[PDB]
C-alpha cells in the first residue's frame, strides 16, 4: 500500500566530553536500513538491511559525508541554541530532527516532513505545504527568519518531493523481497483467572509486517465506542513485530465476543473464538 | 541524507 | 571524468550568438549543480547554481537541469569575447562539489 | 560580505622543500572550508574538506595535510614537496551545513615544483 523514508538525526551535548554523541538512522516504512553512530569505530554510514548493501561504495562515500556534516551542523546548534536559551555550559542537551516523504499505492509523492526538537519539544517544522513554518517561541522566530532569508524551504522540497520520493521509489524496488512482502500474523487466545471465578482473554499477533495491525474485540451487540485495552506494537527483535488486545467478560464462561484482526497481508479478516 | 536545505539554526 | 563529462573544446561562438554549455553527470544522488567561469591564470568565479528541474536566468545566463538524463547546461545570451573563458561543470555529491575539466569558450569578436 | 584570501600567490619551489599554504575566510561563521588541487586541463580536485569541528572528508593525498588553527583560517602543508605535486591550490568555504550558501574559491595559488 504506502510507503515512507524517514531519517532521524539524535544530537546529545556532553558538558565536558568535548564531542557531542550523534546518532543517526534511516528507515524505509517498519525497516531501519542504514545508521550511524559517532561513537563506533568505523565512521561511517553502515549498512542494517541487505538490499542497500548493493549500493556501491560512491553511494556509501557521500552518504558518510553528508551525515557527517549533519553532525557538525547540529553541533554548533546546541551552542547556538544554549545562548538563546540562557542556559549554562553544564547541563546536556538534545537536539533532534527527523525529515522524510510519503506515497501512496501508485508510488507518488503524498506528504512531506521536516522538523526539529531541543530538549524533547518543538522548536521548528516545516508546515503541510512545503513553504511556511511552524516556530515555537522567540528563540525559533530568529530561525525562522534566518532560514526565510535563505531559502530553506524551497531546498527542503525540492530533496523531498523529488528526490526523498526518487530513493523511495529505488529502495522499494531493489529491496522487493522484504520491504512489499507482507506476513501475516501467527493467532493465539490466552485465558487468564484466579481461583474464584474471574476471567479475561488477548487475541495475539505474532510474527507480522508490516507494524500496522488493526486488532478490535466484536462486542456481540454493540455501540461504535467499546472498551479492550491495549499494549504497543513491540519489535521481535527479527523482521517481525508482535501485540496483543484484552477485553473482560462474565466472572466465568463466556463464547458472546470475538476477535476482528485486519492485518494488510491478510486477504479475510481473521475471527477467533476462545478454546484450549 | 539530504545534500540540500540543512543549516544551523 | 566519469563523474562528470563535459566538451573539452576549444568551441566558436560568435559575438552576439548564444553560446551553450553541456554537461552529464553520473552520480545519481546529486541533489544541486554549479557552473563557473574560469579566465585563463585565474581561480575559478561562481556563475550560478541550481538544486532544482528547470531552467534558472540570472542576466544573460540561463542554467538548466534534467535529471531524468542527468544533464546539465549554461546559456550565455547575447555572447561578449570577454565571456571567453573555460565553463566548468560542478555536481554536489554530498557536503563538496565534483568538477569537470570544462568547456573553454572562444568568442571572436 | 563574505571573503576568502589566500596566501601565497606563486610559489616556485626545489624537490622536497616543505610547502605551507595559507587561507582565510571573513564575514561568515563556522564555514566548511575545502582545498582543491587544479591541473593544467583539468578540473579542481578535491584534497581536503572540513567542517568547522574538524575533518570530514579527505581523497587522501599522498605528501599533504591540512589544519584549521582558527574558525577562519585553514591551512595546506607539506614536509617534502615532490615535483608531481606542481599544481593550482584552491580554497574554497560553503556556509555551515549542507545548503546553497558561499561555495566561492578565493584567488588559488600556484605552485610549481622543480628538479
Known amino acids: 500500500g504506502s510507503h515512507s523514508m524517514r531519517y532521524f538525526f539524535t544530537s546529545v551535548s556532553r558538558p565536558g566530553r568535548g564531542e557531542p554523541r550523534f546518532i543517526a538512522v534511516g528507515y524505509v516504512d517498519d525497516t531501519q536500513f542504514v545508521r550511524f553512530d559517532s561513537d563506533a569505530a568505523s565512521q561511517r554510514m553502515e549498512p542494517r538491511a541487505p538490499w542497500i548493501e548493493q549500493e556501491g561504495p560512491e553511494y556509501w562515500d557521500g552518504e558518510t559525508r553528508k551525515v557527517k556534516a549533519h553532525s557538525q551542523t547540529h553541533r554548533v546548534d546546541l551552542g547556538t541554541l544554549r545562548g538563546y536559551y540562557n542556559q549554562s555550559e553544564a547541563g546536556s542537551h538534545t537536539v533532534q530532527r527527523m525529515y522524510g516523504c510519503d506515497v501512496g499505492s501508485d508510488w507518488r509523492f503524498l506528504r512531506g516532513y521536516h522538523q526539529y526538537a531541543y530538549d524533547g519539544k518543538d522548536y521548528i517544522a516545516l508546515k503541510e505545504d512545503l513553504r511556511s513554518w511552524t516556530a515555537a517561541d522567540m528563540a525559533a522566530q530568529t530561525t525562522k527568519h534566518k532560514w526565510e532569508a535563505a531559502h530553506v524551504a524551497e531546498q527542503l522540497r525540492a530533496y523531498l518531493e523529488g528526490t526523498c520520493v526518487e530513493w523511495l521509489r529505488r529502495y522499494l524496488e531493489n529491496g522487493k523481497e522484504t520491504l512489499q512482502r507482507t506476513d501475516a500474523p501467527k493467532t493465539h487466545m490466552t485465558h487468564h483467572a484466579v481461583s474464584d471465578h474471574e476471567a479475561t482473554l488477548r487475541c495475539w499477533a505474532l510474527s507480522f509486517y508490516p507494524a500496522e495491525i488493526t486488532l478490535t474485540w466484536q462486542r456481540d451487540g454493540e455501540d461504535q465506542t467499546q472498551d479492550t485495552e491495549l499494549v504497543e506494537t513491540r519489535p521481535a527483535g527479527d523482521g517481525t513485530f508482535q501485540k496483543w488486545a484484552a477485553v473482560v467478560v462474565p466472572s466465568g464462561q463466556e463464547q458472546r465476543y470475538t476477535c476482528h484482526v485486519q492485518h494488510e497481508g491478510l486477504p479475510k479478516p481473521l475471527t477467533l473464538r476462545w478454546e484450549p | 541524507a539530504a545534500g540540500i536545505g540543512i543549516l544551523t539554526v | 571524468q566519469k563523474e562528470v563529462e563535459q566538451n573539452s573544446g576549444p568551441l566558436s561562438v560568435p559575438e552576439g550568438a548564444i553560446a551553450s554549455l553541456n554537461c552529464t553527470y553520473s552520480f545519481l544522488g546529486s541533489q544541486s549543480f554549479f557552473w563557473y567561469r574560469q579566465y585563463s591564470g585565474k581561480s575559478p568565479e561562481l556563475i550560478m547554481f541550481?538544486?532544482?528541474?528547470g531552467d534558472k536566468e540570472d542576466g544573460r545566463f540561463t542554467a538548466q537541469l534534467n535529471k531524468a538524463s542527468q544533464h546539465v547546461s549554461l546559456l550565455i545570451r547575447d555572447s561578449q569575447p570577454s565571456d571567453s573563458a573555460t565553463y566548468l561543470c560542478?555536481?554536489?555529491?554530498?557536503?563538496?562539489?565534483?568538477f569537470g575539466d570544462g568547456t573553454t569558450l572562444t568568442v571572436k569578436p | 560580505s563574505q571573503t576568502i584570501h589566500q596566501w601565497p600567490a606563486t610559489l616556485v619551489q626545489p624537490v622536497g622543500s616543505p610547502l605551507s599554504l595559507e587561507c582565510t575566510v571573513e564575514?561568515?561563521?563556522?564555514?566548511?572550508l575545502y582545498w582543491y588541487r587544479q591541473a593544467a586541463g583539468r578540473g579542481p580536485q578535491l584534497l581536503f574538506y572540513?567542517?568547522?569541528?574538524?575533518?570530514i572528508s579527505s581523497e587522501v593525498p599522498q605528501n599533504l595535510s591540512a589544519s584549521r588553527p582558527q574558525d577562519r583560517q585553514f591551512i595546506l602543508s607539506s614536509k617534502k614537496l615532490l615535483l608531481s605535486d606542481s599544481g593550482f591550490y584552491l580554497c574554497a568555504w560553503s556556509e555551515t551545513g549542507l545548503g546553497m550558501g558561499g561555495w566561492q574559491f578565493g584567488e588559488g595559488s600556484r605552485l610549481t615544483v622543480l628538479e
Open positions: 572540513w567542517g568547522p569541528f574538524g575533518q
Open positions: 564575514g561568515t561563521s563556522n564555514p566548511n
Open positions: 541550481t538544486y532544482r528541474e
Open positions: 560542478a555536481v554536489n555529491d554530498g557536503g563538496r562539489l565534483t
